[PDB]
């Protein structure tokens, strides 16, 4: 899944999602679906704003 | 935008799609089927620009608070 | 035919199995459904073809109105039969009808071949206008390299290639164009205009476009030029003990410069990654963002690799130190901080690698194998490629190995910066110092007897193929081929 | 809130314009489509199920199988898992080695010249029978009924008809003189079958199928076959045993193999091997290639081995065509060839006839029987050990230029299959094997001095002498041989590797290559060591049983090893 | 004078003339396989007879466990592998590489969560238990999917391989098992029908664990025959996942010859030998052992592979660790089917009868031949009543190539034993290993070689002391590639590849010319050899398709028409070799299809006729092979009359559903479709839109429209 | 010409081309015939004035 | 570039002087310890120009 995240998302959004996961002590690697969800959430928020 | 929305009746082709003025609603088929409702765009988009501007605003806010 | 389509659909649905499978399998699952074929593949194609060519009607003709152009028997020669078929539900025919069609019959349109098969005719053009020269029968040194077999109009990754092909020759089923059609808009419109006015089956055009766009790369033994134009003719140009002169009938430097400029602009600021990616995806080269040639070539300069990492792309996982490309072979090095006195008399606290290690080392055209222990270089094997490249390889491997002799060979000072005005780590400061003054550690390094052997021969400090070589350095008159398993392993970006 | 199915819920409908909602929905739909294409959509789990993870638990039977499939000393797979995850070996290999018996080891012994001994000494022994001729067709004994033709290519039946028409004495011969009936075949069956063959070939009708269809059934032995019953009766009956395996005979070195090797590797005024044209050569490299190709074909074309190879290829092609076209009817097949002389006269040569049995076979490994009658000028009584499988006649005599010589007919029953039948038409690759190596040879020479030597190696020039290999021997004195003769020898070696090829040949070559490479290492003073020499020797020599080429290869290997031993003194 | 071909080696090195030694021009050996299978079972159990012998209580078949068994006291092959030593080798490999195991396992898991069930359709013939035969992988998978539907098993419709493996593991617990079997009912005619058959749990377990056998006839360079085993579909997913994991691990390992093929392998070989030559101490000797392992799969216990899988996934999700450990479990309890049985005949009555394997022991052994007598007297203990042999220990050839290679590389990488003054390293690939041992003299070199041999014997690996030898570095052979003094002759074995590809005229020609050019690039085929290969290939191509030069007086059905075309068209340099045209191909233009090559030389009428937009000889469904020529080889051809196809030699359900979907959505045939809806509704919507567009364009009549819409409404989509 | 202008516009004192590729392949300097020993020419039949 | 005591000096003499000066400079800058210094002068003493 991580390959799809790298391809379809910018490195900036990935970094923000990884930082958010770290704040919650959640490993992005062990929960790639959650990382994708957070990246999509950030992307849609930026797109709205 | 939206689902099938049969109010438009049957689907319309790309050539007939262009006839619709900006902001209209049309009933189209996406990929292999998948009926959906679409709206003609009034602009050209750039997702990368939007993301970059959002990041710029975010870091401007971070610096201003800092 | 649409009525025939609906009638066939109704007849198929009349059976309950069709009704239950169609209403059960989603569109995505269709692929699986297609792959449930017999797979009763012919065991020996040669024997099958031989037998079939002798049969009365081996050709499987598709049902249609074409057959009426030709009688079932012409000039007393049987051509086609009206018997029904079960395998294909069409008719049967013989090569006699094919030859007659090549002789007489409907005359088609010649326009389509001017542009549809553009790649093949470009191949022929490059062959015809090529200029040949002499033949050198002497032995040829060849290196195994990852080369592109055929030239490409615009190299793109397979998924982008498929999406572009669909956007070209499949106007329907084009939901939500991705961030790939705008990049290749010129290619889209050019191919669309060129292929318009044809009647060839769409699958043929799709496969030809895939060949024309999707890259094909392989390991090959090459000597000399490496562009796809020369690789096309590599079977004639090269030779184990013979070589031929051939001249077949840019953006790279610009992208290098642009990536370097972006790196320098972004580094000086804080949070360089976001600024760098903003400029990279906001840049353009005359028709397209930077994700049109970066995604084309494999790897490249370190700046391009860093930018690709900042963007979304795959980069070869070779370790870049200065100019050296390093590939670990074995051993694990423990990076531990240590306080070491430099030859200038100053004392620096830097990280040193405890333990033995070995790396394939590349620099420009120079390849070699380096084996190093902690605080010492042990062995280095190289091939004679170029004086400049060999000197760069020697010096850079010297600095990287962190040999105590290299530290004791310093004579000037280490306080340099970059174009952005930043103080670097002592390793890169030493790299710059030694590259600027190559004749600093070379003099005090010490010399070693020549590698007495059949082929192993030494090299002196001046890079000339002269005996009484450097301690450890060895030049073998063979071919060193390295850098296997380009896994492109997952790499993070800070 | 936005969903992947193009629907949304907004607290206020004026917060976002049409464009914003459309764009977000388009991005979501694109993400969904890309995930579905990558099959991640089903795997993807939303913001309520992403806290669970994949579920894949083992049932009862599989768990029990895992429990009982643990190495010795364990009693449950949980125990093994914990042991592997926790225990750390820090020298277990040395602990095991420190106790393993010292009676196990590679037994490393250095290999010297004396250790190497001749392979397959039993061939020398005279008590064993001389190896027989088991090849499909005669090679150095073929008699070509040659008819000059304008060049027209005609059906083989008509060609054989005309060839016999020219030689009325042999066509109409009807009283045979049995020279030898080998062991089992019946003279009456074979002679009557041959007479039917001649009558069918000479008949007015274009049909080339046997007109008897019943006498051949017993002549070819098709009816002499067992009848299959069901398993129950075989179980009940006590006399239905299992046939003991039939091992090949252990034979000795013959003499006909050497003579054929010599004769097939000599120039003949007759040439048959012809090749299609290719496009004009414009590059210098293809010009050099054309020169080399011409120099090679000028040599190979005139060797008799090329004619034999073409005869084999044509016969097998015709056999395959007849089998595919005709399945359950006996057929007549001339062994035809086409031969162009130096003057350009395209003679058609008839070498004999063959009756093809019933080839109605679904599979490929199934055997089809064919009986071959071959014209020859050799009286077998000169060497009866070469022909223990052949029943022959003496069907007359002929004059080639005024020197009368007899003409016999060698008759033999044999069997083939679709695999060998196809490989017959793929036997032309021998030519390639003959060129590749020589090409390499020439290229090596070109590497030494810059210019091209293909004229120098073949014929020589004013600066370099013609290249000569070591080819033969006589009275213990090895003899050199021109480049062309060496190329001929290699081509004949490849042709024999084909014709006498079977399991024994493969097992012999692939296992004697070990000794070949060991000798090569010894000649370079690499001091090769071996672990079990007698094992390799036994492996090699368990293949020299009855294949004539294998026995002659063993003989030549022993002779060459003796030569290398005597020459190693320097 | 007596000729002697061997004398060529007096004036030439063997490696230079090595190509002539191999008899790769004659008929390869070809074949009952029951004897060979029984012999293989006998040898497999014999090597491990000293292990722990117990009886499986899940299936009732005898099992022999050699792992952790007695240490061998003789040179004979030993399957007694010590688990602790295997774990030590794995730990040393892990230490020598940075988290390679974790990366490989994670990547395998990720690509597994993306894999679909249909990937199991690839490969070769597979054992089908519904019929207890060997059937094409696609057909076997389809039949098992169909059977599972009856016993409340699902997941194939769910897509990914995870649900399919989950319900496969579930199936082993169902108290019954229903499926469809072929019934050849007599009616005289033998008509096949489908009969709903049922089998119990033990029978189904045995069927799933059974390994079908066949004779490896295609072999070229081996006198004695070996038996190749095909496994069922219920092991294909797990074996595939473990093989992918092992490939991921071994690809990074520089000691692994697989999966890289071609010039890459030569590069690796030369690089390794150069490395070892560089690493030699001063005046020391680096000896190369040319090894050819034997009994490479009759000594490898699947329990060792289970341990390797568990250790490799040390840090991974529990579910994945359990999933990837199923294949070693299934292989550790496998059963072997036994050919078709021996044949007994009486010559006094001209009677013969083949005895099916289940009846092997229904006959007094005094009637089989003495050799088969001993074979059966030794096979009796493990013989199952149904006619199968219980074969727990060892592996059949071809299953775990990557995992066995990884174990071999683990053995290689130890690099030292007891800190003795030597080192070793080498190349290993699927039963072929070449070793290099560096020391200060020959004696220490062989001390190291013996130590490595002993270490191999501690893992079930038993290098062949008869097929192996040792010499000085710089001359050896690896996987039939010979290295000598830097010269790596690609042993010319691609000769049996110049025959017509048997797909069609243009495609066969393109494949042949590409083969010639690739051989020139790779194997060093000289220009003269390539020209002669072109000549021979063109001869065979003209002969096989009955199309020679129009001028030539040869007779034939198509030849008369070719003759007619020869003078009916003026431009005679543009015809194709399939139309009796003159050959034009040479070395310089093997990379160009001839149709484009002769495009200028053709005549307007000829090119119009041949390159017609529509050809009854060209069909859409015939395009499947236009990309890859069956190994999948890429070839470049041109659409034309000569692009035809040969005649053919829930089946119809799936076949016609897919065909109709392709005919509706022409884009489906090229790229995977996307959608979360039933196929029926997609087709209905597309057909409704197409009907409306056809009418609006005037291509369909009004009555036609009404009929189409009536049918669509009957379908229930309007 | 591009290489020439690049060399002119650089900073090194020397006026020496460093990209010899196009210079070598443009003036036909690689197409010159190779001289062989006179003996081969005498023996050869295709070598004519 | 030019540190040769040219003017008919024997090349061995020039080498001896060059190595003497190099050892002196190495010791003065600290590139070599006193042990290496004395070893080098020992060998240079054995040369004959020292």
Numbering used by the authors:
A (entry chain A): 1 to 49
B (entry chain C): 701 to 766
C (entry chain C): 1 to 249, 256 to 500
D (entry chain A): 147 to 716
E (entry chain B): 1 to 31, 34 to 189, 201 to 643, 652 to 670, 684 to 752
F (entry chain D): 340 to 388
G (entry chain E): 703 to 752
Article passage:
ANP32 comprises a folded, N-terminal leucine-rich repeat (LRR) domain followed by a Glu-, Asp-rich intrinsically disordered region known as the low complexity acidic region (LCAR).
A minority of particles are apo-FluPolB trimers, whose overall structure was determined at 3.57 Å resolution. These particles comprise the FluB replication complex, which is similar to that of FluA, with an additional third polymerase forming a FluPolB symmetrical dimer interface with the replicase. The FluB replication complex is only seen as part of a trimer (determined at 3.57 Å resolution overall), with an additional monomer, FluPolB(S), making a symmetrical FluB-type dimer interface with the replicase. The encapsidase component of the FluB replication complex cannot simultaneously make a symmetrical dimer as it uses the same interface (i.e. the PA-arch and PB1 β-hairpin) to interact with the replicase. For FluPolB, based on the observed trimer structure, where the third FluPolB forms a different symmetrical interface with the replicase, we speculate that it could have a distinct role.
